[model samples]
Target: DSCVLRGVMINKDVTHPRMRRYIKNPRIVLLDSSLEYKDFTRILQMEEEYIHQLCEDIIQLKPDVVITEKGISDLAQHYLMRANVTAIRRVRKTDNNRIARACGARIVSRPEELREDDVGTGAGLLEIKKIGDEYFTFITDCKDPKACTILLRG
Candidate 1:
């Protein structure tokens, strides 16, 4: 089917220094909230190790790709890249839901949050390319066949 099955518009600046420009056959993980504690005092208490541990928890999920509802902490982004997972953040709510459905993944609030059938599986490449200032992640060859696309400019 040549039909555009589904898609999402990632309206956030998600640039991870440790991650590469592209990845293939990645597990798509979608989040509904920021990955960091909003309380700075608590965050300060945790220090650098906090984000690393978060990344570890996330890594344990074996995510090949990650999408966030909001911006992710730099530390977390760093670890995700280290693991070769292409991570994106600051996505619109509806966009996240549609794309997750297309990927056969659920919109999870946390990494530790587990489900017997958690996450949507897709077989394809996850890549973010830039033409001028706009960036879009092209998810291709999903098991579900349904696909979507979004164009975001900053």
Candidate 2:
């Protein structure tokens, strides 16, 4: 159990109010970029089309949990929610890095390049519990987490 790292605190809660609060033995996907489509100077495509395509690519991998360091668009969140995938967004950069290590997932910068290998299968449980007035996410029970989180009590 010593090899298991402490769960890191995610500053925010799930992107959608209806998202699942807990998951077991989940396949996690970590994204470093925004799930929302940005305006292009010479765009020939619709925003929905771009966001839809991005979500489709991610869905192809069949991940149980998707954690991104950037914002997620409403359309993209809807797509993921409809597929029964739990999404957490606006995570701190450092937390994302630690979560990837804890869950054994790669920090993917682009959704188009997401692959099966980018998923983190090392975690046995993923949970979000309320502590005091805030929410804390725990990606625990990893096989051998390379990172750890420790809270010092006064």
Candidate 3:
């Protein structure tokens, strides 16, 4: 019944005004820390052990729905220069799902399925759907900063 919305830390001072406005919602839980460009690159280049730690942070956050700007695979590839790898493989969705299941949470791919409880601390539903070669995503039915945060977490 409880979930957290996570994402790249945006430095209010340097972030785009529009982007800042977009993420100001109440539901958005910025990561414990923000990652700089160099830090992000470092994480991507890290050995498996370090990568696992990153995944652990995600799991530890206990998010029922995880919203990301791009597919994990795509991000990893572009960020790490590993274009041969698939997003699902690099992000280890299976492992993430396993952790989520243990917490009685399901990773949904659509907005209509989001429950009221899922909307707690946020609003509406966040949907991540792949339509053709590109993936399109958004939150429906709510505009509170909190709700926007949850939606972005998907």
Candidate 4:
């Protein structure tokens, strides 16, 4: 019934303004793939549509927040924010694993495979805070977080 994460904070931005900085009882989605589309061909619209499809697939899940271990494209960011979903990209693989444990969410490899159960509802709060010169993300107050974070300072 007790879990804590040690020295774990997502050192990142809120994608942009208008994205919510504080979420209560958030539904979290963790992704391992990049939301950005690759350009193997010279066609620009093709890549745009591909990323659009990815975003649509994600938005369909209605997740409050999406955390991806890979890079997220500007288009993806725009789409997510428009849907009122906060996104955190380029998170470390290890950190994602810890977060999955803490929040009771499954790490999805593909957006198309994301189901309702893939969303983590155990977290009670998700917030963004500025510490020193950088911004950090905090997901806390889980019902039963298996992982935890601790701080050590001088």
Candidate 5:
């Protein structure tokens, strides 16, 4: 029901160590982009192309939820810039909505819009905000066990 995609560091020799640990979880799927070369300054077309491919992969997997690392926006921007696409400063609700629509799924952001039962102690909580008709969600501080639990629940 859950899925994850990891954008590995292309310049690094070894893959991210933590990504392997996540593989042990049955609900998680780790995607490695370690071999791909990405240029953030002017890769909008390439970014869109990659996103399209990733969307196809996600659709085929048919996961109920999709989670990506925090650096997705940065990576996206890099590709966008390289491809001459408009740069997106933030991963806004509209962005999530587009991704959700493509994958036939919904987004679960952090503390801002999480369910009452899902909200936990400081730092650990996940915050989500609804912008216009879209949803934007993210993890706050992961160190707080209680708050982190809430984030994990999402």
Candidate 6:
């Protein structure tokens, strides 16, 4: 039996564990907070509509992958995945920052602020794999990295 170790896998499995993958230099988006809406007082329909628009706006960046600081709503995740994007939910705030910094992108707090430049550049492949009971998204082959954190692509 032979096995290979990929670029540092942090054991978090993202909770939901819905498996997804991308085999290219994907543009990545990092969210400083959760994808789920706050303010529990809004109507569900209107809330979803608003979330839909926000998610669509993020999609505008054409990100191949998105990472959030907290849990992602299943509905939002669905919309994003349906839009042909991979998403990681409930990520550590520290993780999000390091990933974004390493990828040469800023963590936009609002989806509306998502710009083309906010998307992180990937030099190798991006993948979400199941390790045990959880899921993890792995970004590899970055062209520019400062530390063991990450190396971005050109």
Model 6 ranges with Cα > 4 A deviation: 1-8, 14-19, 39-42, 131-135, 145-154
Count of clashing residue pairs in every prediction = 8, 0, 11, 9, 25, 8
In model 6, the Cα lDDT at residue 75 comes to 83
lDDT string for model 5 (16-59, tens) is 22221111111211222221325665587676666655444433
What digit string (tens of lDDT, one per residue) describes model 6 on residues 1-154?
Answer: 1233324344454333453565588788888766786755557887798779879989888887777776788788778878877777767777776676557668888888778888788436676667678756666665664333422333
Model 1 residue 24 CA deviation (Å) reads 2.2
Better of 3 and 6 by TM-score: 6
Model 6: which ten-residue window has the lowest total lDDT?
145-154
lDDT of 4 by residue, 128-148 (tens): 989999998887775773456
Instruction: Indicate whether candidate 1 or candidate 4 has the larger TM-score.
Output: 4
lDDT by residue (tens digit), candidate 1, 1-154 = 2444234434443566456556666677788867665597866768567777767767877877778887777677767878877777777887787777667788877767745366567646666667578876666555654354423332
Candidate 2: residue 152 Cα off by (Å): 9.3
Q: On residues 1-154, what C-alpha lDDT tens digit does candidate 3 reach at each position?
A: 2455532222112111112122222232122121222286756666444444444444443333333322333332233222111112212344333223222234444333444343223433433344556543333434343322232332
Instruction: Give the TM-score (vs. native) of candidate 6.
Output: 0.77
lDDT string, candidate 2, 1-154, tens digits? 3443455556577887789878999999999888987656446358778988889999999999998888998888999999999999888888888888887899999888988889998878888888899987887776774555553222
| RMSD score of candidate 6 (Å) | 5.2
Query: For each candidate, what is the lDDT?
Result: 0.67, 0.83, 0.32, 0.83, 0.31, 0.69
- As for model 5, its CA RMSD to the true structure in angstroms is 17.0
Name the TM-score of candidate 3. 0.31
Give the lDDT of residue 92 in candidate 2. 84
